[PDB]
Design a protein around this ligand. Structure first.
Ligand SMILES: CCOc1cc(C[C@H]2SC(=S)N(CC(=O)O)C2=O)c(Br)c(Br)c1O
Ligand SMILES: CCOc1cc(C[C@H]2SC(=S)N(CC(=O)O)C2=O)c(Br)c(Br)c1O
Lengths: 366, 366
């Protein structure tokens, strides 16, 4: 195996394939990157067994086929450490991989490429393409609502659902939920899968914000995403997701509208004096006015009064303020709409000018 | 106690006095800020018993004398969280302090001002003024060489020494030393004190950069720095700090000069393959050439060859590469000079064009 490539041509690829790592590398080989030269292309692969990232780099300079694996972080750091514009010559010599550039020489240990975890092939059942910007919007709109390491393991990820020509994402931890739908101009079969939390993060990281479109393939137990010369594959969570449609409040009779910035700031200040652990705050809605209060075990209290658009009956309701702030932070719009029912029902929050995303938060009793 | 002031006038002061406070210290009182209204001035004080920060704010609007203490972080967050241009009205009420602005209202818990830790009075023995920029340079030039939780408590701090018309800082952890001297245009007595690590951090944090002069007063067991309307006071560390004069090599005969960036990047790349805990690298000096090598337990190897200016005898010597990189990272000059004597003695590193600072690093066995 032999190849020579410009440092700048390796940086992005190396950065993208090092992602699968980071976790607890009980197995040494998982700390390595698989390098394969074949048909005039260098392929770099990183994996943690649950997912893998593959990057292909065209070789415009002399090369020889072969494969091996080397310590990921060390190889990446060596390449990044070389000067801008450096030509990196790599050759496999026995049980070591040599990296030479200018008057800098490195000899790295290797592990057989034949021993590198090889994720089995699978068949895609659903496929579609969409702008990177659309995937970014879908994940960013709901990611914060995923559970971390909940016993309800199927919540430690994000639902990706296809229906008609829409692609939708849903995330929930059982107490608050986020859903975002976007039409992608392609007839799709009705299908739903859950992508693991780490997979969602990796998918988001692969979007450079360029024009390169994203091609997605979903199988029975895996999902693959193609962007430019990068291919990310992840196992899917083997479980079923909650009925989010039932979560969305039937027909709320109360409607409140207010500036997103003013509302966020009011809740943020009030939160300061809320219980550090349970974070409860109370809302008092009345004719065109909202009063937010909060108190803690130290008997400290905060009160915010804001002008809002509301003409329904007066009502009081409590909420975990962190859940509310998470939603307002996710909504980068001018005005927000809160749809209420009563003090013992959840609230649905949306951008007042768009129904593309909806947030539902359970109320807190007190 | 009562006062009304523009939010803008409270921002910097609150930030400065909240610094000496950490994540809710052992004693509850230390988590509070002391507020005092007297003679048309609002004074804010924060302390951790070891050091104290006092900020004064002129009160132009109507006020009433008095004192109390309130949760530091909460009061700061409330003020910072209010909108730009907000006016903040504060008044003491029973066991609570009320903060009002617009239609935002807060009631904070209090602790008697009479219980707030009060640093004992002391007498200044050494006094001088100097530009903030000079103090910043003195600290930044040596801070990285201070010890970290060493049992030789005196090494965990920074020596501040006055001699002639110069102020000098010295820092060492017993393995490497850093010394920097700067002229301040004033005749001073020969004196030296040790400022605690935390005190050094706090001192640096109070320096913004403005032409606002820094006034320093040093006592037998205290140091005070006054900048604008901010006064910082800290206890000193009682111990015998080592003499840098006896550490600096005497007429070292082997001088090597090289570009700082090139030398730094060479050591940085070699370091990747050095022992992870011991970090040893070997230097081979010869006519206008430097070779740096590194190897680790798994026999991985790095070699860097650089052109340098050197006409001394050939020699090999080892060093902890982290110590070398720390020095090269602290210097922001174009060229560096390394001065050596033999294989079992320390190296002195300095800006080839300035003797304002000097660094000494102990050698490392093969
Ligand atoms: C009045 C009910 O209100 C809410 C209910 C849920 C989710 C629950 S209900 C339910 S049945 N299952 C199991 C399922 O669907 O498999 C759930 O997980 C959420 Br998240 C929110 Br936010 C609600 O406001
Ligand atoms: C001939 C002496 O040479 C050096 C001495 C030091 C100072 C250290 S060693 C040591 S014992 N103590 C006292 C202590 O035990 O705290 C120190 O402070 C340094 Br850093 C360097 Br680099 C030297 O080359």
């Amino acid at each position: 195996m032999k190849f020579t490539v410009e440092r700048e041509h390796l940086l992005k690829p190396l950065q993208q394939v090092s992602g699968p790592l980071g976790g607890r590398p009980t197995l040494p080989i998982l700390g390595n990157l698989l390098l394969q030269v074949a048909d005039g292309t260098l392929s770099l692969t990183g994996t943690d067994l649950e997912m893998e990232m593959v990057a292909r780099v065209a070789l415009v300079q002399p090369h020889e086929p072969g494969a091996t694996t080397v310590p990921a972080r060390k190889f990446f750091d060596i390449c990044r450490g070389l000067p801008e514009g450096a030509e990196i010559a790599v050759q496999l010599e026995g049980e070591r991989m040599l990296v030479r550039s200018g008057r800098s020489r490195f000899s790295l240990s290797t592990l057989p490429a034949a021993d590198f975890p090889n994720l089995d092939d699978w068949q895609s059942e659903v496929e579609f393409t969409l702008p990177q910007a659309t995937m970014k919007r879908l994940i960013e709109a709901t990611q914060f609502s995923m559970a971390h390491q909940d016993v309800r393991y199927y919540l430690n990820g994000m639902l990706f659902e296809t229906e008609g020509e829409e692609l939708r994402t849903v995330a929930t931890d059982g107490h608050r939920l986020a859903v975002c739908s976007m039409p992608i101009g392609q007839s799709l079969p009705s299908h739903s899968v859950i992508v693991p939390r780490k997979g969602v993060i990796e998918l988001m990281r692969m979007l450079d914000g360029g024009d390169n479109p994203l091609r997605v393939q979903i199988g029975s137990n895996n999902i693959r995403a193609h962007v430019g010369d990068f291919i990310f594959t992840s196992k899917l969570v083997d479980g079923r997701f909650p009925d989010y449609r039932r979560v969305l409040p039937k027909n709320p009779d109360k409607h409140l509208e207010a500036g997103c910035d003013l509302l966020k700031q009011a809740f943020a200040r009030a939160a300061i004096l809320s219980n550090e652990k349970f974070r409860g705050v109370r809302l008092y809605v009345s004719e065109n006015q909202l009063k937010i209060t909060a108190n803690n075990p130290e008997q400290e209290e905060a009160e915010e009064i804001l002008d809002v658009t509301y003409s329904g009956a007066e009502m009081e309701i409590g909420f975990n303020v962190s859940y509310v702030l998470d939603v307002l932070n996710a909504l980068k719009c001018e005005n927000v709409r809160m749809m209420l029912t009563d003090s013992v029902s959840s609230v649905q929050i949306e951008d007042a000018a768009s129904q593309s995303a909806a947030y539902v938060v359970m109320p807190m009793r007190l």
